[PDB]
């Protein structure tokens, strides 16, 4: 509704602050959704990838988000990313967000743009034998005026802590950006 605009007006009210700590909290919110699923009993691997264009991917091997109709009459995946930390907050502060779900033998995809406005509905794009959810968002430069570039070392301390706090959970962090390519993995 106007709820996505509200986040875009006072981001600090929803995230912790409107700085580099807030920008990295967008990533932690998406990782927390995969941790929730690990704790639900499904999944043992989380992959975080900093893409060449400055977007970030968070991939898991959980069951994959449910695709049915939510109590509001609207599809579930759409509700999660558009209704008010919450994945809707990430979506509001992103110039673009994409979801990819591997569930019930199928691959579902849904795209959002310019602050969380659905660019498409949930679309069946192929078939799979793999399960899980992959979220890829690009934070908005008009919100984080100073910077939108993720810091490998900042993400790494937090993912290390999540891997230590949970146990039997392999967290991999990757950086694809030109000249600063790095790969790390954490498992306790």
Residues contributing to the site for ligand NOV (CB under 6 A): 33-34, 36-37, 60, 62-63, 65-66, 80, 87, 133
State how far the Cα of 1 lies from the Cα of 4, in Å rounded to an integer: 6
Q: To the nearest whole angstrom, how small is the minimum distance from the Cβ of residue 133 to ligand NOV?
A: 4
Q: To the nearest whole angstrom, how small is the minimum distance from the Cβ of residue 43 to ligand NOV?
A: 8
State how far the Cα of 153 lies from the Cα of 158, in Å rounded to an integer: 9
Polymer length in residues for the chain: 188
Nearer to ligand NOV (CB atom), residue 37 or residue 78: 37
Q: To the nearest whole angstrom, how small is the minimum distance from the Cβ of residue 46 to ligand NOV?
A: 9
Nearer to ligand NOV (CB atom), residue 23 or residue 90: 90
Nearer to ligand NOV (CB atom), residue 89 or residue 143: 89
CB 79 within 8 A of CB 72: yes
Q: To the nearest whole angstrom, how small is the minimum distance from the Cβ of residue 113 to ligand NOV?
A: 18
- Tokens 């406005």 locate to 117
> CA end-to-end span of the chain, whole Å?
42
State how far the Cα of 77 lies from the Cα of 61, in Å rounded to an integer: 17
């Amino acid at each position: 509704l106007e709820g996505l605009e509200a986040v875009r007006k006072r981001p600090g009210m929803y995230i912790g602050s409107t700085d580099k700590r807030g920008l990295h909290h967008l990533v932690y919110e998406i990782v927390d959704n995969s941790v929730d699923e690990v704790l639900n009993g499904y999944g043992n691997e989380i992959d975080v990838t900093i893409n060449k264009d400055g977007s970030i991917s968070i991939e898991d091997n959980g069951r994959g988000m449910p695709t049915g109709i939510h109590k509001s009459g609207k599809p579930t995946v759409e509700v999660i990313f558009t209704v008010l930390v919450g994945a809707s907050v990430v979506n509001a502060l992103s110039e673009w967000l994409e979801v990819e779900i591997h569930r019930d033998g199928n691959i579902y995809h849904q795209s959002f743009k310019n602050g969380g406005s659905p660019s498409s509905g949930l679309v069946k794009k192929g078939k799979t034998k793999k399960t899980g959810t992959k979220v890829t968002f690009k934070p908005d430069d008009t919100i984080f005026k100073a910077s939108t570039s993720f810091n490998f070392d900042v993400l790494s301390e937090r993912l290390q802590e999540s891997a230590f706090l949970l146990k039997n959970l392999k967290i991999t962090l990757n950086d694809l950006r030109s000249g600063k390519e790095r790969q790390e993995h954490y498992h306790y």
